[PDB]
Structure formats: structure tokens, C-alpha cells
Amino acid sequence: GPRVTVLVREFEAFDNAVPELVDSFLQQDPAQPVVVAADTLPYPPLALPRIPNVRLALLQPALDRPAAASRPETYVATEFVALVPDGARAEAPGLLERMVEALRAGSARLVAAPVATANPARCLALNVSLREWTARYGAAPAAPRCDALDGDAVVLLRARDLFNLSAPLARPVGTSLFLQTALRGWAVQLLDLTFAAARQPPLATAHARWKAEREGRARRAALLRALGIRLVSWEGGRLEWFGCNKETTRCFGTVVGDTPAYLYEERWTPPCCLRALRETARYVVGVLEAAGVRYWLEGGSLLGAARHGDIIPWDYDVDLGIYLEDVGNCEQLRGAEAGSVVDERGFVWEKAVEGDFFRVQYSESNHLHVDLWPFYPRNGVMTKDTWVEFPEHFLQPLVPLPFAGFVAQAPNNYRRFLELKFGPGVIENPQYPNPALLS
Amino acid sequence: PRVTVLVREFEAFDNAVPELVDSFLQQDPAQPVVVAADTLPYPPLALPRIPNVRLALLQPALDRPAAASRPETYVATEFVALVPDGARAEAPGLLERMVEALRAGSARLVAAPVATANPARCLALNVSLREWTARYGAAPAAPRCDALDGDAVVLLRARDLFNLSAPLARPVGTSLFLQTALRGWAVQLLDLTFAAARQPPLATAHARWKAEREGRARRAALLRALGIRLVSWEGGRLEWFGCNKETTRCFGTVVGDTPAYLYEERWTPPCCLRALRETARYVVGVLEAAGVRYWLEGGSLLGAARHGDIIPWDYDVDLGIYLEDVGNCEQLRGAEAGSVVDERGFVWEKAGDFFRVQYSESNHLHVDLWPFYPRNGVMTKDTVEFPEHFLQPLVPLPFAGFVAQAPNNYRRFLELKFGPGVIENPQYPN
Amino acid sequence: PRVTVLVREFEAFDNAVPELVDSFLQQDPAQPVVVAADTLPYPPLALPRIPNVRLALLQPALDRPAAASRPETYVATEFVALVPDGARAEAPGLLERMVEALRAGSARLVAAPVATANPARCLALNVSLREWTARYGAAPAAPRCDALDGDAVVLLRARDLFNLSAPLARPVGTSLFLQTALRGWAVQLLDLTFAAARQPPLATAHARWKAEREGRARRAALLRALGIRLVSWEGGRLEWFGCNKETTRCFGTVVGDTPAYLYEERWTPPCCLRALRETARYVVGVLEAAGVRYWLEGGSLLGAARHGDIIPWDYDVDLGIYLEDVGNCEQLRGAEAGSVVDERGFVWEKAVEGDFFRVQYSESNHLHVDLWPFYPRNGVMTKDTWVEFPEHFLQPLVPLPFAGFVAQAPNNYRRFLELKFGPGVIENPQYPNPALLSLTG
Amino acid sequence: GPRVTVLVREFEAFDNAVPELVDSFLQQDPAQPVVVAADTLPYPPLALPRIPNVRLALLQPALDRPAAASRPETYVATEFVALVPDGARAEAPGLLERMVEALRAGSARLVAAPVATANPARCLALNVSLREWTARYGAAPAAPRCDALDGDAVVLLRARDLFNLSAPLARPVGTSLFLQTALRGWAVQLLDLTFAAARQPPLATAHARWKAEREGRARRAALLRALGIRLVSWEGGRLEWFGCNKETTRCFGTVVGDTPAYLYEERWTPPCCLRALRETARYVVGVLEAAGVRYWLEGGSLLGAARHGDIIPWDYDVDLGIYLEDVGNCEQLRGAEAGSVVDERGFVWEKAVEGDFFRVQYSESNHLHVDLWPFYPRNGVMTKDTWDVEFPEHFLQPLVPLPFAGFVAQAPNNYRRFLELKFGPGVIENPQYPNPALLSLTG
Ligand SMILES: *[C@@H]1O[C@H](CO)[C@@H](O)[C@H](O)[C@H]1NC(C)=O
Ligand SMILES: *[C@@H]1O[C@H](CO)[C@@H](O)[C@H](O)[C@H]1NC(C)=O
Ligand SMILES: *[C@@H]1O[C@H](CO)[C@@H](O)[C@H](O)[C@H]1NC(C)=O
Ligand SMILES: *[C@@H]1O[C@H](CO)[C@@H](O)[C@H](O)[C@H]1NC(C)=O
Ligand SMILES: *[C@@H]1O[C@H](CO)[C@@H](O)[C@H](O)[C@H]1NC(C)=O
Ligand SMILES: *[C@@H]1O[C@H](CO)[C@@H](O)[C@H](O)[C@H]1NC(C)=O
Ligand SMILES: *[C@@H]1O[C@H](CO)[C@@H](O)[C@H](O)[C@H]1NC(C)=O
Ligand SMILES: *[C@@H]1O[C@H](CO)[C@@H](O)[C@H](O)[C@H]1NC(C)=O
Ligand SMILES: [Mg+2]
Ligand SMILES: [Mg+2]
Ligand SMILES: [Mg+2]
Ligand SMILES: [Mg+2]
Ligand SMILES: [Mg+2]
Ligand SMILES: [Mg+2]
Ligand SMILES: [Mg+2]
Ligand SMILES: [Zn+2]
Ligand SMILES: [Zn+2]
Ligand SMILES: [Zn+2]
Ligand SMILES: [Zn+2]
């Protein structure tokens, strides 16, 4: 009744137990369909049995092959497919059949069986938010029904479901598969069945292990970058980042038309970029306060503070107003008028090209910035020479207002200040930076 | 509902297999297709070189493993559809509908005719290995039948097809249903119809004649391999695949009078039985032409009394003759000097008490003639006896398609020679 | 019990298999024994009716499952010992001794001679599927061999034997080592001897004659089925199993210009090459006696310049001739009026299509030499149907070995070839490419 | 209904004329199907007309898209596709239909029309050899029938043919398309039709051109490495290399079970590896001749010299024999007995792990090597006390010149005999190129 193709994707060419894996399934059924998938032909040779029911699917482009040759669904003729990791072995007979039976009888589109390795699979919850570039894992509230798995498992599903995914075999599969299935609201049922481990497991030496863990980590980082996951969180608070830092370029490059590239991709500001802007805003405020420079939250930064005490989630910089006469109080600002200045913490201060303002960048390589706009009073009206004006009484006095994790100084009556600069109801009506292009 | 298309019946010199395959790929580009052949077809089929289309070469090769010639290893799906050359897929989901009918019905095979010039028809089929015979007729319970004649897509479970002894032996239309009918399986001839190829194969008369010739040769080789010596039809037509006047007989030299077919748990090959009947008829004609008194003897008289024919596991014919009449017939006179091959190719020899007439020089199915003489009211030979009144007179008795001569009161005669109740209690081989 | 005795080489009408089986059961009543046959042997073998002795009938049958004709179905031990008829177990423990030898050495097979009149000899064997040739010779590293000649018990793992395509194809002594030698497997001939049967089979001249006639027929059918067209011993004593003067050529009609053997990932059959060499030598001899100027052309000239023979994946021979010399040859004059079969069976024909002449090996075998007549016009040899070349390449002609005789070639033939084919053609063969042929067609 | 889909793949996000291109085709037929294909959403925005017959095809995996979304055939519903490069514009009406008419009536799978830029397309010959990892370009002998094009052209072919290729839209299309079509034996016919250039051409400054060329050359280098093209040549020269060199590891790395990785790929030795082997062989021979070491071609090197004067194209090292008595003549060899020596030109000389031979590697990183096998006479026989079959000494008295790998080396006298003794009768005449099927069976 049930035909199941075994599909092997997670293995290392320098050190693997794929021959044992495939032979253990052949011992239960000599005609068992098996597909080993690889990006390039493994060397040293896998030396799989060269029989028609065992096939190697190379997922690489080639001058002498058709398109179908790198599409793994054309190697799978059966209704069901079972993803089997290296290090597993078939020992008990008919396990795939019991998995098929459980899937037909259940409600999850995926069923799974742990492998009795030193790291068997465990049930996990998972939320994916592409707009915020974040994947949030947690403990499974309704185990053994999960959104994702952590560790080694045989995962069985219908071929039509697996190969309608965008990247069915992207490595690591343990990360890539459940990111895609959870996003679609699919569940994986963790069954009470266990596959045995290989008798001679792969990666038996500490050096061979260490080599494999580093290659895997490199593949996971590349995968998350390819798919737009900048941040992974775990319950307990553990964070791992996959985007910006002080030592790299910022994520999105130069902005045209006030609308950064990620907005056209229906995503908001990457969380790593937002983290850096908050750190730069916190730092610059500390420097100005220690130097005796009067400053106040400006533009979108003040708007975000008034709404929810933080940067607007699709914004990409921070604006502060300062008193023009106070500029000479700050060492970095005095230096900036002479040229670019890299200070005690690696931040870069410059007097800008465009319009008589200062710009503080997170680092020499990461150009996320705070802009400082000098104003001087003319007759109770704050103004500048290169370009709106506003009454000085909004700055007399300033008021405290949470922003980006700290307390910042804002104009008093900032609701009216914001409506004077943006229009009535701006606090209550969020918009994109300019809606004629994108709303 | 995954079904592998499997193509076995085509000719390399003239086929429509590329169109057949392309037509199924137009409905599903990932459709599993297996084209099976004994050797690599030339001119090249030039099938699409995609993973879901595969050529399975069934003959042994020095550079291949055992699995490479085993077809179940090319088929991963639950169901398999045998598709003949000349068919094409036009509407979608026809294999799906065949799968539904199979699961809904009670026949292990379902079939959909192909709209060729010879779309499949239902047939009844009765297979007797003991008698080396397959009997075909009209199907009483159509559209449920034992076998098909003509073009059809046939769908069954892969586990059923590939546990057969010769699942892809050619011609499939003969070999498959011989095996399924023997197992008591039925094929349901569904009401769906597959279209014919838009450019059919064998368009010329020469090509069709060539293909019919090769096909007849394959069917003959297949039936001889599988132990079918006779195919008979309702209405009387006979098809012979055994020995004849110019060949050896099917079983050769006998040892311990137990011919080889008995150890195979079979009876006498029907072609051998036919040759014995013709030799019996011929010899009787010669004997009666020359005025030689003969009567049925031994197992021949027993079979005549029982069912008017040779006992179906027997392998010769015995006749008694009056020793005093031997000189009346030329062949017997010659047989005393040496072997005589007469005008009709029969071989008469003396060799021994008796005379032996063989069907031909190559085919050694024979009639033995046993001369007796009346000594004092008892018939006797010189190397068991019986009273002469059993021959005074002789009586007509049908045997082997003609009217033979038998001793009078022959049921009593037979119980003399074999024991009481021999006619009613045949000694069946075991 | 780790070894199953398997008997495949015997004749139904005259064998010593009952003594063979008995001799092994006398040493161990539980010894697994399998007698393999295509059909039920007659007269009856009458083997002991015990669970460890089985007769395996390998032919498909209307009333049997697929497994009944698969020999691995009948073996449940790690090893198989192939034992020929005429052997007998006398000393106990011989099979266990072969297993120990096998495990401790590097050969996949180990063998023990049987003490018959034809005890097994160690042989070298190279199998070339591309050239359809099996080359035997004396074994340089005896007692490590590629093949055996004569009677021996051969032990190997059941997993190795039954993974082969034709594990029990007859004669086993031929088919087994063709398959194992191709895989690079060695057989080690041990210092162990099995005794001969006390009543040997085939003890009369007539019985031996019947057996050898049947054996020869099975061997010929086996080599044709497996694509071995030529068997040689030390490069000589050639045995042919392909086409000849009275048959069609092996590959038949070519479409369009890719013969069948290239799709089979092989080269030209050596019997076809042999017929081409004979035809080229005959035609050249005819042209020379008649006084027809000729020279090697095209791939024939390329082959001669490369290695003095036909390019081994090519399938014909090309010669250029002087058009004005055509009249000096009876066969060529006859060919312009119609097809001519000359006194030695060669068929000379004039191509109405391409304006050349064609000489075929025989009426049935269409391996051919093509003759291309050129005529000079202002010092350039040219033709009226289709590359032309300067006449000085033919003034004079030079000798050049080709296909076992000395042929005529243009002078400066290296330059000549480079002009026709391109620079470096002689040093860079266009080797057949199965992968590419699969792609292009 | 239209029968051609315009497909735009070659353009740069930072500076393109794709909006003008799309508009020019829509002006001839507002229903004209147009696909713009890209690996990521182009930024700045292309702002293409939001109509059903204009579509952006993003060829990238994404967590929220089905498999079909990244497959370009999904976006084409017509029989034909016209690949149009940025910088082109549709002015004359009906040019695509004339191309369809040309393709149907001719015998080329592809037809093309130059674009009137500063780099209009030219007709080229192209031979692709996967076994030799080489793409050989040249002037087209049968123009306007070509194997490949260089420069800007609109190329038309059946969608069924384009999207059946392994890498139909791999960049640069001008390189990857014709590598795939020429390998298949398909021809492209350059038609006598011309597309106009855009009124505002892209990449109009030297700086913009510089940025575009740097990226395009990076895409090309990555493309050829992924496809196994190690060498590009023009008219047999102007060599362009994409393999290993003195500063890298060799292509096939560590060899396991006497079978290098290129054999399992069903190819021969990479041409960069062969180039480095010839250079190392010439260098080592030059060193031995200057130092007064007697040497001769040995084994498969001698076989290759005798057969065609070069390394056997699927071999991966070089073997020479030397008189052991002469070893002390060479400084590098005398140092090699103490330990590894990196000489003045980066070559690494070592005395073997076990086996009593010397090894000279191309560099510290690149381990392509020449092996030197020392022999010594024991009364007429050459022998090494470690085991390269022993042979009579008269084959070395005298030595003979033999072309090998671009220079003249020394070989044993009567080398045909010599070779047949070591390899067997007829070895020179019977080369056996690798059999990947046999390899797939034997391992
Ligand atoms: C059978 O032979 C093939 C070679 O064609 C090999 O790949 C496979 O591993 C072998 N299987 C066994 C069980 O030895
Ligand atoms: C996932 O989202 C659901 C829906 O709001 C929420 O109840 C749950 O706490 C989230 N879990 C994690 C681990 O983010
Ligand atoms: C995608 O799913 C459909 C049915 O929803 C199925 O017919 C098709 O084969 C699937 N595609 C792949 C590539 O698996
Ligand atoms: C696709 O390309 C392969 C060659 O690799 C060929 O066999 C197949 O027929 C092609 N299919 C189409 C539709 O062109
Ligand atoms: C098969 O046997 C049945 C009785 O079991 C008989 O009625 C039928 O006629 C036989 N088949 C044929 C084709 O005669
Ligand atoms: C025979 O049938 C059994 C049970 O259905 C199955 O396990 C086996 O695979 C079949 N044999 C084949 C398909 O060759
Ligand atoms: C077999 O091939 C080897 C080369 O690999 C050769 O030395 C030997 O002479 C050959 N033997 C025969 C009998 O051809
Ligand atoms: C391509 O190959 C052909 C035939 O081998 C040859 O004539 C031609 O010169 C080659 N062209 C190039 C550019 O190498
Ligand atoms: Mg802002
Ligand atoms: Mg700003
Ligand atoms: Mg046709
Ligand atoms: Mg009798
Ligand atoms: Mg020719
Ligand atoms: Mg060498
Ligand atoms: Mg070496
Ligand atoms: Zn960032
Ligand atoms: Zn008969
Ligand atoms: Zn031949
Ligand atoms: Zn290299």
C-alpha cells in the first residue's frame, strides 16, 4: 500500500555513514527507493550500490544536464518521502509503514521519529516574522505536536507537500524545513518511534566533529542570511544575530527617495540595524550631556518617542536638535568642523556635505547614524540658515521622554510640536516616509 | 495516486514510443515512465534524459549488477500501467480513474482499450499445465474476463505484477494473462478509452508484415518456454507449438518406462498424442489394406474402452496381429530384412518379438505390433496368452478418431489382462 | 555450516551428481547442497529428500513466484562453493580450509583443482567491452589469477556471486571469470585438491562428444549474448563470434551517421574491423594490378598516420582515385552499368547519389570501402559533388602502413591531414563520448 | 495573441534603462508580455507599469513563496521567448514577429538580431569540451550561422528549449547561454535585423561602466568555475584561466584510492593542472641537465611522449628515472635527503615518505609533482632496491631526444621496445581513455 522514498541530505563528504544508512534500508527491502542529494559530487566517493532504486541527485547546474536533473522531485516517484539524517540506521522492520499509518490517521502534515543519537529530536514551538526578520523558538505548548524540531529525526511527509516548498532541501534541513512549514501553519507530530543510530557513527574523532560543527554553523548562517532571518530568539532570552555589527557594513545601503530598499520588500528595518541606532543614540546623548550641549529629540525620533518610546520600526536614522552656540562645548564637534573624527568608542563624527548639520556614524564601516541639527534663536524663534522654524518656548524647558531604552530630552508640549511639524493627528496615524512612492 | 507507465510491447525498427512518452509528460512533466527492452533499441528512441524517464534493459551484461535487469527496481510506485505502443494520453487523469476503478472493484487487473484498429476484447481463458494446453473462448461474464485480445492499457499493483515469474515476457498480451488466469485473477475491461498515436507505427504493409512475423516468432518461443504445446479456441481452431513429422518427439528416450513428463507432474504433450493418433490411423489403414487381422491391445484397448482414445499419460500404441498374415503387407516383409521408410515417411522395424512403426525418421513416437498365433484354441507368442474366442469375432470400437477393431466382450478381456474394475479405476500418475 | 555447495555444470544424460552430493553428505549430513538446472533433469537425479539438499529450477514457469528462478533464494550461508560434476569430497574439512584461505588473502575468489584429467590452470584475462574482446594468456603472478581453465571448486561470498548479472550462466568456467575479471577480482588457486568421482561421468568417447557439442553451443550463445566477439590466447589462436562473409554486418543500417555500437558505449566490433581490413587489402590489390592510382583518404589516412590501422571506432574505409584511371579496372567499368558481384564475392557498386564507387565485403555483409575519383583542373584535384586539394600532394605518392599491408598515401600526409582536418588532428583523437552522445543525439 | 515573451536578465540595478526598454515594447503592443528577471528585488525601484502582462520574476528562494515562484518558465505563457539586453529599445514595429518567421523557416534553434549599441553582436565559433574543461572561441567560418555571440543581441528561441536548459538565466547570459547551446550542437543564426539603442543609454559614464564591468567579470569567473570551464581561449591563444595556480591548492586535492576526483566527474585532467605539470617537468629537467644528472622519461610520461609528445591527458603526474650515482650532483636533491627544500623558485623537493624516490612539487600549496626514480646498474641490469620493473642497462646507453610537454627530453633508446616490455605489446597504439562506467562498477 504505502511507498516511501528515503531521501538523504544532511551528511558530510569528508566523513559520513551514508553507505551504512543506505544498506540498512536495503536489508529490509532490496528494492527500497533511495535518493541521496548533494550540491556537488562527493569526493571521496560515496560508493553507493549502483542499482536502479538508489540514485544520487546533484542539485548543481551543469552544461550537459537538463533543468529536471537538479530538481529533486523528479527523483521521487512515491506518494511519501522520508528525510533521514546521516548517523541513522534502519534496524526494526516496517518503521516507515508505521509512520505512514500515523500520518494518514493524524492531522499534522509532517510526522517525525527521533534517532537514538547523542542528540535526539525534541519538540519546539516556532514563530516566523519576515517583516521583522526574526524567528522565535520556544518550548512546545502542545507536545508531541510541534512547529519545529531540535536534533536528529526521520521526518516523513508527502512528496507533493515537501517539493512545493521554495527551498525543500536547503541546508541545514533541520533549520530550513521548519522555518518554511511553520510559516505556513503546518505542524509536525513527534511520534513515539525511534530509529537506531549507526553502528560506526560518522565524526568519531573530536577533530572530525569540530570540523563538521564549523561547516554546519557556516551553512546555517548563510541560510538565515539568504532567507532574511536576522535574529533568532529562544525562550530564556538567548539571542543569536545574523546581520549588522560594529565591524561590518550596514544592512541596506544608500537610501533614495526617502524609502529604503527593505520597505519595497514588504519588510521593516532589520533588528540589528535598529539595535545599532539605539546604541548610537544612547552614546551621542551621553556625550552631549557630559559636554554641556543642549539637545532635544527631533523629527521621526521624537515622533517615535511620543508613540511608543522607541525608533519607528521602519525608520533608519535618528535626529536630534542642538543649540548652535553649544557646539564648541563638545570635543568631537569641534574636531568634526576640521574633518572626520573617530572617537574613543569608534564612532565617527563629521560635518556633513549637504546642509550645515553634523552626522555621527556607528563605526567606520557601519554607516547607521545620528544627525545633529544646530538651531539658534533669532527672536524667540529657532532657526537655521540651510534647509521648519519653531518657537523657542518649545525648548523652555525641555521635558523627559523615554526613547530607545533611556530617558531623552524632548520639547515641552511635544504633541503640539509634532503636529506643527507633521500635521494634525500625526501621532495617531503612522505612515511610511513618503506615501506617493510606497504606502 | 502515483502510477508508473511501463512500455514493453514495441518494435525497435518502427515504433511510436517517443510520442507515447511525450504525451504522458505533457499531462505531468514528472510522470514516472519506464521503457523496458531486452537490448538497447536502435535506431535510438531518444527519450527525454530526465530522472523520471528510464530505459530498463532486461538482459544480462558483463558490466552490470543483478539488480539492473530486475524491473521492480525501476518502479517505486504502488501501481503500474502497462501501455502498448500506438497509444497516447490525451485527456488528463485517466490513470487516476483506472486506479479508482481498481480500488472500487474486485478484479486485481483493470484495463482500458486503446482506440487502435484492434482495441482489446474480453476473453475467457482456461490453462491446464498437466495437458500443456491453454483454451480460449468468449467471456461469459464480460466485462469481467480472464484475458484480453488486442490493445489495452492494463493497470495493477506493482507487488502483484512483479511477483509473477515472467511479468514482462513477450508478447505481454499472451504471457501476462496466462499467469494471472492460472492464479484465478480477473481483469475488468473498463469503459474508458485511450487515444491512438497521432502518427501510428507500422503505417506500411511491409512494416506490419515484418512486425507480425517477429511477433509470431516471439509468441512461439514464449509458449515453448512456458510449457504450452497447444492453444485451442472455442469454435475449434488449434494452434500447435510442439513436435511434428520433421522434429524429435518432445520427451526423447524413456528410462524405466517413466517418461520425463511424469516427473514434471504433467501428462503426455498433446502434440505427441496427436502424432500417435495419426500413426495409429495410418498403420491400421496399411494393415487393413493388406488384409492383416489386427485388434487393439494393452493400454490402447483400455483407453478405447474407457474414453475412445489414448490414455492421456501413455506414450505409445499397441496392436495385436495374426502371425500368419504378416506376409500379406509389404512393409512387414521389408521390416524383416531391415529398417523400411515407406512412401509416407513412416519407419517400420522388427528389432525382440514384435514390429514397431515410428511416426518418422526423426520423430520416434511409435505403434507396436504384436503377432500371435493360434496353437490349440489359445493365442500365444514365444518370448501373456488368452483364448482365441475373444477374436471370433472382432467388434468395432472408436479409438483415436477412427473406428478400430477390438476383441469381442472386451471389458471381460480387459479384466483378464489387468484385473477387475480397471476401466473405471484409472491409475493416475502421482 | 557456512558454505553451500552449488552444482551447475553437469549433463542430464550422463553425470556423477548423485555421487557428488553423497560424498559431501558423508562428511556432514547437514551440508547445504543446491543443484541448479534450467529444467528438471532427466533421468531423475534422485537426490536425498532432506531439507539441506534442494534442486533449483531457474527457468521461469507459469505456476511459480518470481523468487523460484532467483538462485540466491536457495542459499542461506555466507559462502558458496561452485563444484563441477566429476568431483567428490573425500578428505573432511576442505571447504572450511578454503574459507580460511579466502578470509586471510586479498582475492575475492579462491579455488581448488579437482583431480580429473583436466585440472584447473591459472590464467590471465583482460576483458575489453569497447573492443568486444576477451584476451587470455599465461598468468604472470600465478597462483593469483584472473581466470581458470579446467575443473576446480571455486569458493566466494554468496553476496558477491549473486550480485553478478549472470551468476550461473553456462559454461560457468567461462562466464564467471569474464564477470569477475572485468570487476578487477582475483582468484587464488590454492594448494588443495579435491578427489575425482570414483565413477567419472562422460567416460565414453560418444558421451564426451555429445557433452562437448552442447558445451560449445552454450559457450557460443553466451559470448554473443554478452558481447564478446573475439577471444584470443596470447594475442593469437583467434576465436570469432561475430559477423562474416555469409552474414549481415553486426550493426546493420546506420542512422544517420552514428552506428549502433556507439550508443552501446563500445567501439567497432573486431569482426567488422577484420572484414574492413580484408576488403581494403583486396580492393587495393585489385586497383594496383589494374593500374589505378589510389591513395588513402579521410579517416583511413588519419588512422594510417596515427597508428597504421583503421580508427577503432570507425566503420568504413575511404580511398581517392584518379577518375581517368577508372576504365582500367573491370569491376569499376562493370559498376557503372549496375551492381557487380566479382569472383571472390565482393560487391562493386556506383553511387548514383554521391558520385563515388562502393565495394562491399559480400552480398549480405555491407562493410565497405568507398572509392572517390578526383580529376585535376589547373593543378588542383577536384570533383563535381560533395574539399579539393593541390595536385602536388600526389606527385609522388608515398608508402604508408595501413591495416596489415603497405598502402599509398599523399606525400607530406601530415600537412595534407592538417589541411583537411585541422592542426594537431593526428595527436588529438576525437575519442567517442557516451555522455556527449546522450546529450546531443 | 502575442507569441513572444520579452525577457530581461542582463541589467544593473544601480544604473539601467529597463524602464525605457519595457515602455518601448508596450508602445508597439500594450499587451506585449514582458518579464524582468532578477535575483533580488532591484533597488532603486524599477517602477514598471502595473499591468498583468508585465511581471518581475525573482529567482531566489524565499520562506513565503512556493517552488514555482523562482522558476522562470512559470512567468512565460507563449511559445517563444526573446532575451533582450538592457540598452535596447523597440522602435520598428513587428521585429519580434519577423524573428519568429525566420526561426520557423530556418534550421537554427536560435535566431538573433544585433542591438545598435557601441558593441553590436558578432558571430563566433565555439567548441565546448567538458572532458578537457575548455571553451574554445574563434571566428565563425559559416557566418551568419554561429555557435555563439559576442556583444549585444536580442536572442529568440522556443521557451521549451530555453527553460529545459540547466541554467537558462545564469549570468552573464551572453556567456552561459551559448556554452549550453553550443555543447548541444545548436546553432544561432544572426539575422539581418537591428534593434535600436535606448535614447538614454545606461552606464553612460566611465565610472559606471567600470562598476558594471567589475561585477560582470566577477559573475563570469564564478559562472565558469561552477560549470567546470577552467580555460577559455580565443583562436587557440589569449589564454584565460579559471583553475589552480602556484598560489593555490591543485584542483583535485588529495587523491584517494589511486583515482583522482576528475575521473568520477567523467572528465579528464584539468588543463591548469596539466599546464603546471608541464612547467614543473620543464623546470626539473632543466635543473637536472645543468647539474649533470642523467635522467630519462619513465612510465606514463615516456608513453605520452612516444604517443603524442605530451602528458597523457587524463594522467596527473610526471615520472623520470635518474642514475642514483648522480644524485649528489644536484643541490636540491642533496638537500632533499635531509628534509623538504623549497628552492629559489618555489618548487618543493622531498625524499619519499617510503619508496626511495624523490618528489618535486609545483609549490608549497600546489602538490602537482614530478617523481624521480633512481636506478643503478648491477652488471647490465637497472634496479632500485625498493619497489617500477627492472630493465637492462643498454636501453640507457645511449639516450635519445624525444619531444615532451613543449620541450625536448631524454628517453631510453628504442623506447618502443622499452615501453612494450613495461606495459605490454602495442601499448603506444592502444590508448584507453577513462571508462567511467567501469569505474562505477569497480569503484
Ligand atoms: C553489486 O555490484 C555493484 C556494481 O555494479 C555495486 O555498486 C554494489 O555495491 C554491489 N552490491 C553488493 C551487495 O556487493
Ligand atoms: C508565538 O506566537 C503566539 C501567537 O501570539 C504566541 O502565543 C506565542 O507566545 C509565541 N511563541 C513564541 C515562542 O514566540
Ligand atoms: C505541487 O503540488 C501539486 C498539487 O498541489 C502537485 O501536483 C505538484 O506535483 C507539486 N509540485 C512539486 C514540484 O512537487
Ligand atoms: C531536455 O533536454 C534533454 C537533454 O538533456 C533532452 O533529452 C530532452 O528531450 C529535452 N526536453 C525538451 C522538451 O526539449
Ligand atoms: C475452463 O473451465 C470451466 C469449468 O471450470 C469450463 O466451463 C470452461 O469452458 C473452461 N474454459 C474454456 C475456455 O473452455
Ligand atoms: C511481492 O509481494 C510482497 C507482498 O505484497 C512484497 O513485499 C514484495 O515486494 C513483492 N515483490 C516484488 C514487488 O517484486
Ligand atoms: C593484460 O593487460 C595488461 C596491462 O594492463 C598487460 O600487461 C597484459 O599483457 C595483458 N594480458 C593479456 C593476456 O593481454
Ligand atoms: C572546433 O572544432 C572543429 C572540429 O573539430 C575545428 O575544425 C575548429 O577549428 C574548432 N574551432 C575552434 C575555435 O577551436
Ligand atoms: Mg528619524
Ligand atoms: Mg535623516
Ligand atoms: Mg513513425
Ligand atoms: Mg510399449
Ligand atoms: Mg563514409
Ligand atoms: Mg606518468
Ligand atoms: Mg605516480
Ligand atoms: Zn543590520
Ligand atoms: Zn510432442
Ligand atoms: Zn562484425
Ligand atoms: Zn588545476
What does this entry look like structurally?
The structure is a homotetramer. Chain A has 439 residues and is an alpha+beta fold. Chain A folds into two domains: 1-243, no CATH class; 244-439, no CATH class. Helix content of chain A is 25%, strand content 25%. Chain A is built from ten helices and 25 strands. The A-D interface holds A 41, 43-45, 47, 50, 60-70, 128, 130, 163-168, 170, 179-180, 183, 226-229, 253, 256-257, 261, 264-265, 437 and D 41, 43-45, 60-70, 128, 130, 163-168, 170, 179-180, 183, 226-229, 252-253, 256-257, 259, 261, 264-265, 440-441, 443. Bound molecules: 2-acetamido-2-deoxy-beta-D-glucopyranose (8 copies), magnesium ion (MG) (7 copies) and zinc ion (ZN) (4 copies). Residues 316, 368 of chain B line the site of one magnesium ion (MG). Chain C: Zn(2+) binds at residues 243, 250, 271-272. Chain C: It is a single-pass type II membrane protein. Chain C: Its EC number is 2.7.8.-. Chain C: This is Ribitol 5-phosphate transferase FKRP.
- Mass-distribution shape of chain A: elongated
Which structural class matches the secondary elements of chain A?
Answer: alpha+beta
Strand composition percent of chain A: 15-25%
Number of helices of chain A: 10
The rounded Rg of chain A comes to: 29 Å
- Give the names of the bound compounds: 2-acetamido-2-deoxy-beta-D-glucopyranose, magnesium ion, zinc ion
- The separation of the N and C termini of chain A measures 54 Å
Largest sheet of chain A: 8 strands, mixed
The spatial strand order of the largest sheet of chain A comes to 3-2-1-4-11-6-12-9
Total of domains of chain A: 2
Largest interface, counted by CB within 8 Å of the partner chain's CB: A-D, 40 and 42 residues
Q: List the quaternary state of the chains.
A: homotetramer
- List how many beta strands of chain A DSSP finds: 25
Helix content of chain A: 25-40%
